[PDB]
Amino acid sequence: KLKVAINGFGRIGRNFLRCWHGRKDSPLDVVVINDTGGVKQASHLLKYDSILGTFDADVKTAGDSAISVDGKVIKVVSDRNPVNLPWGDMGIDLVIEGTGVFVDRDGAGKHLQAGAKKVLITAPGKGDIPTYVVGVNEEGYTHADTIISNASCTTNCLAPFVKVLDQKFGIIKGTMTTTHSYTGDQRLLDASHRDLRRARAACLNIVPTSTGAAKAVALVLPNLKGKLNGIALRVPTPNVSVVDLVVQVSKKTFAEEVNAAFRESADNELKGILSVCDEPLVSIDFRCTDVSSTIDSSLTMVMGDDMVKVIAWYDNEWGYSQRVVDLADIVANKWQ
Amino acid sequence: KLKVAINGFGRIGRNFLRCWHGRKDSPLDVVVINDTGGVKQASHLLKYDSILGTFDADVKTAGDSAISVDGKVIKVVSDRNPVNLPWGDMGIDLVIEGTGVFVDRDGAGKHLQAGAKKVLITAPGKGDIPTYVVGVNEEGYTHADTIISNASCTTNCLAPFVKVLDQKFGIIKGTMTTTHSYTGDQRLLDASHRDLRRARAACLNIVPTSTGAAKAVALVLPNLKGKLNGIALRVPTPNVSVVDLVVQVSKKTFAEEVNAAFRESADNELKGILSVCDEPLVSIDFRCTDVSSTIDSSLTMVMGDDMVKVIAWYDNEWGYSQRVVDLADIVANKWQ
Amino acid sequence: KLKVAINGFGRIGRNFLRCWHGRKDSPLDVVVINDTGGVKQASHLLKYDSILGTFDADVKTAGDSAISVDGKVIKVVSDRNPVNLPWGDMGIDLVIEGTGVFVDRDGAGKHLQAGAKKVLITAPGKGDIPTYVVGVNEEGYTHADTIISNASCTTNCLAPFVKVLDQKFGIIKGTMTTTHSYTGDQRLLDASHRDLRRARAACLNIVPTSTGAAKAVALVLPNLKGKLNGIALRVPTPNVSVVDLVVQVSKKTFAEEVNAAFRESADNELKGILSVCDEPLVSIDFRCTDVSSTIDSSLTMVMGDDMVKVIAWYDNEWGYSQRVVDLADIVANKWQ
Amino acid sequence: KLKVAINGFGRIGRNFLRCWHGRKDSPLDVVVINDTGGVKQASHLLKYDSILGTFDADVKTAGDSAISVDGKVIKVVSDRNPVNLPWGDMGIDLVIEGTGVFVDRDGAGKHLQAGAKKVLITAPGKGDIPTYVVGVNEEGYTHADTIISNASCTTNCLAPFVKVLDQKFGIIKGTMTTTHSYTGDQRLLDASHRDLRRARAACLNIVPTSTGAAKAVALVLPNLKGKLNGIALRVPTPNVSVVDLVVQVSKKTFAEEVNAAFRESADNELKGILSVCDEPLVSIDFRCTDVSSTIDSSLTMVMGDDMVKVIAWYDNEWGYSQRVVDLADIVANKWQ
Numbered sequence A, B, C, D: 001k002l003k004v005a006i007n008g009f010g011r012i013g014r015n016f017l018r019c020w021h022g023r024k025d026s027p028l029d030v031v032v033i034n035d036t037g038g039v040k041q042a043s044h045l046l047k048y049d050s051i052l053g054t055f056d057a058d059v060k061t062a063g064d065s066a067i068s069v070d071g072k073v074i075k076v077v078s079d080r081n082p083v084n085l086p087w088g089d090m091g092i093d094l095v096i097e098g099t100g101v102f103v104d105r106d107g108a109g110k111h112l113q114a115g116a117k118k119v120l121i122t123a124p125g126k127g128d129i130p131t132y133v134v135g136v137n138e139e140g141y142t143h144a145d146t147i148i149s150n151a152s153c154t155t156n157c158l159a160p161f162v163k164v165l166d167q168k169f170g171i172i173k174g175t176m177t178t179t180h181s182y183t184g185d186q187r188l189l190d191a192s193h194r195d196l197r198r199a200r201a202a203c204l205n206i207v208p209t210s211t212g213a214a215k216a217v218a219l220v221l222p223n224l225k226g227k228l229n230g231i232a233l234r235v236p237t238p239n240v241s242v243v244d245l246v247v248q249v250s251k252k253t254f255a256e257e258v259n260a261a262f263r264e265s266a267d268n269e270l271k272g273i274l275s276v277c278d279e280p281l282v283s284i285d286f287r288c289t290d291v292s293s294t295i296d297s298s299l300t301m302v303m304g305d306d307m308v309k310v311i312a313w314y315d316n317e318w319g320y321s322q323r324v325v326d327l328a329d330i331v332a333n334k335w336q
Ligand SMILES: NC(=O)C1=CN([C@@H]2O[C@H](COP(=O)(O)OP(=O)(O)OC[C@H]3O[C@@H](n4cnc5c(N)ncnc54)[C@H](OP(=O)(O)O)[C@@H]3O)[C@@H](O)[C@H]2O)C=CC1
Pocket: A007, A008, A009, A010, A011, A012, A013, A034, A036, A037, A079, A080, A081, A082, A098, A099, A100, A101, A122, A123, A151, A152, A153, A183, A184, A315, A316, A317, A318, A320, D191, D192
């Protein structure tokens, strides 16, 4: 059974733990967490969550170097520097890197220095880091990869259906805009930030900001290299986001044919990854959905027979986290 | 001097009054208001505004059938039925219809029955109603028109630059999505509404909803008939919205050429209607801007040489209201 | 087997139904709902809720005048005029008045004229209407009462622990302030309203407003007559509120003792009604709590040995609805 | 001609500068700003503000180490270590400590080591640091104080009217609760924090937290020593807060009399510091008010002739910053 370590017990770190906790017969086993905030803080923020609600499990605090969840305990380490982490001592097989600071080979490699065997970054990698999106190119994964990236939340929402669109209609070019819930990277009130837009009060504005999803899609789907670009619009919601993709395709089509193409994948190769919703819902209704992307069938439009517009919802926190568990499961099941 | 009457003292009704108050040497003269809420309520909500801030003017309450603003008084009527209104008695020349309920010829025509000479609907008209967008087709207006529409806020933001795009590059087809601030039509908490999405808590969700701007553009710009479609995404902000337009054009171009095309119009035929912003701002920064549309130059993108994506900001309340005053001014200056 | 009818399928009406649905061996049978919005709306808003999340039950429309919940079919009617409802024809024993418009005898009386045998107003009754707060004075209820009131959510949170305070320390005089979540009665954006403060944008302000909870407590707790007063502060949160009580007691005490008095009562006389939380929690953590009041023990203070300050949380929608169910249960248990 | 340096260009630092900029014949000369974010950021965030709106002044960068405001050039430096600041070299007379990190003697002392002649902490000082509240005890300030504190926004709103209450009615004991807007110290989304409640999503909860304002009032008002206590409730509003005071007074009185006492003081001893509003207003209406406290007269209540409840509003950012300017003005006026 794969011994897992969670580096950075934040939104994704905690969502990951709770997603894993819900899996039946998991090949993973979370033995340690690195929360630079304290054992008591880890147990408290794990039990009480403003987004997921109160954790339906017995969350207690063990000694002062570990917490308890439904009985099974998990040690709690604390060190802003990976090289010191007791990964080697504990024999950590995989480190879930969710700090948002160690994304390049050197930064993430430190976990390896500490004694870890593998590292899975819960974000896009930097400079030669194999990226994988479950349902798109996960089959290209090999146990030889010591450092891997699960891409971004937007990329995991877009890639699945872009793959279907390209395969069935052939994308020529396109553009995307994601109306995204605010995240920890933004500021509560106008404050310093390298990105002068993200520096503005998050709950008060619609804030345009760059996104890497467009180019990231090209990584997991080589055929899209240089065909897409896009932006993000952060808005006053705490979780759940939506992507608006517009593409010109080679084969003429219409809205209902596109929707059917999505349903076919949803019922087959993309079951559990892509879903198609025919009800008139809103963002709050997609909270805690396990899929990576949900097409709002009713909003699909086709202009001039070859300009397709698709609207897809995604729980950037929970949905993405389920994909982290899936990739971790792959790393385990394909362990040699 | 044109005698004006404001029917429905709501967001637009009040914004209109304050916009007019700020104009220098106005050809209009607001003599009466129809607030089914009371003289005291009119004066209070006119003086104190959660969006515009406290009205910098002496707002008092006269008798009980009129209010006072910086000295000049304005009578206050109250009747949910236009046919009864004392328009004839007062000799009302133009009625600013901002109730949101009298948009067809029959409904708005009642103001005419009451004795009003003209009616200007602060919203899209229904069934054979001449619609005008200042800076696009206002020249087609004639004093013979007894009932006219100033279209919607989104239409006033989109039309101006779509006109420039079509004239300079030739639009083949396109799609639009407006991330719009919530409005009075939505619900504070999940409650009844014909639109099951707009029925959901407005400050808590991203709510997809239909928009008529796409087809409305075709009204003021015949050449666009059947070339555009789009949707709206209402989000948790009280005012200021943004439109994301994607179009395939006939002439190949690039981002900087498109921006320059917009600047040229902004400095000329569209001065005061269209503006181009080169700073990294957010929605809050566009509050109280007088223009109908402001291009976020830095976000303009061109894919595959002919797929143009443009992001434009607009103060749906204040910006639109300034356009209502402009159209009213036209009705006055062109009065025969 | 009380035949129950729900008049007004709003926040409380829907919370009521879901609360009732979760009870085991209920003496109530909800057979009809009067939803002026129609069958599709009732089914949709019952299934999807921005606060409660998606109803974990099979909810769907049944024909054109009913809906089903896990196979249980419930008739749906639509009439704003209570006198025309088919209560007598259907043999309705109890009507749950959750409209907020028929809170007086002449109004609620309309249901009796329509044939209903009794009415329970989900709010303070207006005039000489018997009001009951479960855990405080319900034993005073009599089958002879044809129209009763369950009081407000605020009164239901306050009364319970004030009963404990008065019984063990003796309240001489006091004042309270409730920091209440916004409700449908408030305005989304500055709009007409009897209360010039409730007329202001709800998600943007701290809105002071009157409250009758202080006086209402004297109806269920005769001893407190003329001893308490209070006001309310509506803040930008969708659900869950909190009461701040300051009372001068006859018996000198201290914080630890006061909390002790609350715990013993919560473990006996007020079990299931009053609770005491020793955790450093926030509003969202109290969502969907079945009790009527939860004392935040760490906030209890006592100044000069006799001035006590108590802070208690309460889910104004769900917690109160559980109480409506309980009061309805009492009506059934004492039915003659 | 006091040479002033602003350390920490945050909400208060920027509000300070804008407040100072609006004063006529100021004895202060802001010559330098230490903004760890850099020159472009300082210029940008000073010009664009989500709360104050766009600064009506020509703001722009000047070279690579300064900015200008209407032609007035201000040097900008960037160092997180106060000891390395060029205070002595520049001849800085007074440092405005708005970082929130150097509030103790050893910390603020670092500025003195760097050559500054005096430090004014924009917050409660930690330890034996003289604290002053303009309108309450400023006359006690002496040029000999090298490090002083202007107290918190809450203490500045409370002290003024509590001085009036104590002087005309005699306060025996009391308790207060402040419904405060969120601040940068809180978390955007559930994240690490010393205070497990402040760690919770700020725009989503009512967050209780400790306050030292009650005790701080005793520092500027010796008479109230050990007579008051209190707590704070952080709510989802960006700016403007309100204090709820409940005191037991020695002199029996009534609401109208208490308000009368406040008005006479606001017209004399506390003019420009304390104000009384007789309008039914909401938080947003008190934005950018220069006074430190505004009593909401219609909310004043008196229970049992001696229990008084007072509610006062205060712009925690702007109102308090005007006070920092005034205290700075005093430092200049008493300079030796
Ligand atoms: N939130 C979401 O929906 C998505 C986020 N992501 C990405 O995942 C990453 C994390 O996001 P999110 O979970 O929202 O953020 P969080 O702030 O919740 O989590 C980051 C965690 O890392 C900790 N940390 C920071 N520095 C270090 C360090 N040097 N060493 C060890 N631990 C450290 C932080 O502690 P502390 O705050 O105290 O410094 C925090 O606990 C980011 O790259 C984000 O872009 C990807 C998909 C979705």
